């Protein structure tokens, strides 16, 4: 037996963090182009699966 | 960037001339309307004479 594939989970940023909050999100861009970076990562596993 | 989903995939790959492929831009939710408030139905005043 062996795996050749996961589960192709992709996230949300700002869904995750804040999520239906205009505040938390305008605080949330202060820190910058992080979760742009987390959400390319998870689709680059996602299509390496 | 708020024309289209094709100038929104413009907008969000910071480029003119995408290419053959599938692009994950954002992140839509209905809109919440009527916005209902809901307390316990007593009028006593507190008795902070
Ligand atoms: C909580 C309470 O009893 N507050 C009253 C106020 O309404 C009144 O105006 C004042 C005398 O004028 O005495 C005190």
């Given at each position: ?49 | ?8 995939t413009?907008?969000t790959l910071k480029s ?34």
């Amino acid at each position: 037996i062996l795996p050749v594939s996961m589960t192709k989970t992709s996230v949300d940023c700002t869904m995750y963090i804040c999520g239906d909050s205009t505040e938390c999100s305008n605080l949330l861009l202060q820190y910058g182009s992080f979760c742009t970076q987390l959400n390319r990562a998870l689709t680059g596993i996602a299509v390496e699966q | 960037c708020a024309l289209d989903p094709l100038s929104e995939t413009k907008c969000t790959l910071k480029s003119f001339t995408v290419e053959k492929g599938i692009y994950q831009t954002s992140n839509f939710r209905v809109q919440p309307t009527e916005s209902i408030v809901r307390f316990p139905n007593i009028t006593n005043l507190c008795p902070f004479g």
